[PDB]
């Protein structure tokens, strides 16, 4: 019945800098016995798609092989996970967990992001394929590749007319090597409508672009 609460939901810090993750238990997880007092709390690291890994437990004790830059501290009701010098490979979601009472419960997680230099996106546009147009539907895709930060505005235009509601976005997780993002934007259209307009354009706005970038094509050429 113990509720764990983590703060903040996400943080971004530069290479070599300190990341701080706070965790609060609804009830004290400090257990008293004949031996020393121990805080029944553990920390875990989870990269997308990969097996979670035990980092710390008893609040402060490092698991074998965990680098010393990971430091667990706190007592009773307040706890902190400290990353002395963040590395790209450190990008992950971190969760705390109490095992003082049953059932064991976890925090909501904190996303740790690496704040790297600004990188402008490489923009590409893809018309619907002849295969799909034969199938009766039409999808126009716009790719923003290897950019940072994540924030970016994609606006579709059909014959210079701005689009809204007919597109959907998807963003990759921060890369493990260059710590960049990639974004897809899909304009879904009906075949009949697609054939009535000529120029399709994807205009991108980003912190790394001095001015909006445009990638477009003409349907029939």
């Amino acid at each position: 019945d113990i509720v764990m609460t983590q703060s903040p939901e996400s943080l971004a810090v530069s290479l070599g800098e300190r990341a701080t993750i706070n965790c609060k238990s609804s009830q004290s997880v400090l257990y008293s016995s004949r031996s020393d007092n121990k805080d029944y709390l553990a920390w875990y690291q989870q990269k997308p798609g990969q097996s979670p890994k035990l980092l710390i437990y008893w609040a402060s004790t490092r698991e074998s092989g965990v680098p010393e830059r990971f430091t667990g501290s706190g007592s009773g009701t307040d706890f902190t996970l400290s990353i002395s010098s963040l590395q790209a490979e450190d990008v992950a979601v971190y969760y705390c967990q109490q095992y003082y009472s049953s059932p064991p419960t976890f925090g909501g997680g904190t996303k740790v992001e690496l704040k790297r230099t600004v990188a402008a996106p490489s923009v590409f546009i893809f018309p619907p394929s002849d295969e799909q147009l034969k199938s009766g539907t039409a999808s126009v895709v716009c790719l923003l590749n290897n950019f940072y930060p994540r924030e970016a505005k994609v606006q579709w235009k059909v014959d210079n007319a701005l689009q809204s509601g007919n597109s959907q976005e998807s963003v990759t997780e921060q890369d493990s090597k260059d710590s960049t993002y990639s974004l897809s934007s899909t304009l879904t259209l009906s075949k009949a409508d697609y054939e009535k307009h000529k120029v399709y354009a994807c205009e991108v706005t980003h912190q790394g672009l001095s001015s909006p970038v445009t990638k477009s094509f003409n349907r029939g050429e």
């Binding site: 437990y57 799909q132 999808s139 976005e169 998807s170 990759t172």
Partner: protein, 220 residues
């Protein structure tokens, strides 16, 4: 140390499903094992605990009476029998080893985890994807659009796994149709398009779909 969960997929509400977890690298027979799950965009939730000899079993009140944890120590395999499944049971299910030493009660410290197995519970029809090329027209971008499939997930490789640099498979997006859509892209030297063949290998296991679409460049 390896924990590999298998089984899992889509099931209609009310039906059952059995997960398995093959273990190696530790004395499985003498260690306490757990099941922990993670619902979409939420935190971990402990599900079940089982002792070395199965004499002591424990379940989360959220699954009590519906799930059964068992194990076969001769084959170093952990089992989770899930019955009367509900929409809220949709999650990636992890197999985990407890840090407690042999013959001691559980520490509830999850020393080792598996990579997890996705369990989907929906009364929605399974459907495979349609794979269309994102044709390229000193670096050129190729891709494949994987459209109108359900339930998740699909996995995309390029050139039977030989091409992995510059690949970005985007997370699925649910359309107003209720079907998922996904894209996978790859950047490649522009000078290889006329000679090198690029084939996206899409795999959607729920529907038993496995497509190899060759992406041809546009030349003008």
């Amino acid at each position: 140390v390896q924990l590999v969960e298998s089984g899992g997929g889509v099931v209609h509400p009310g039906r059952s499903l059995r997960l398995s977890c093959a273990a190696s690298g530790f004395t499985f027979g003498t260690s306490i094992m757990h099941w922990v799950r993670q619902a979409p965009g939420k935190g971990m939730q402990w599900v079940a605990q089982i002792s070395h000899d199965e004499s002591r079993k424990f379940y989360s009140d959220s699954v009590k009476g519906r799930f059964t944890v068992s194990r076969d120590n001769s084959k170093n395999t952990l089992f989770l029998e899930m019955s009367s499944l509900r929409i809220e049971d949709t999650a990636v299910y992890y197999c985990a080893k407890d840090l407690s030493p042999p013959y001691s009660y559980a520490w509830d410290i999850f020393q080792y985890w598996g990579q997890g197995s996705l369990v989907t519970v929906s009364g929605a029809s399974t459907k495979g994807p349609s794979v269309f090329p994102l044709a390229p027209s000193g670096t050129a971008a190729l891709g494949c659009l994987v459209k109108d499939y359900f339930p998740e997930p699909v996995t995309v490789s390029w050139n039977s796994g030989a091409l992995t640099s510059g690949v970005h498979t985007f997370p699925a997006v649910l359309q107003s149709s209720g079907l998922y859509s996904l894209s996978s892209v790859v950047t490649v030297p522009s000078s290889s398009l006329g000679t090198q063949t690029y084939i996206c290998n899409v795999n959607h296991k729920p529907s038993n779909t496995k497509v190899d679409k060759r992406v041809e460049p546009k030349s003008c």
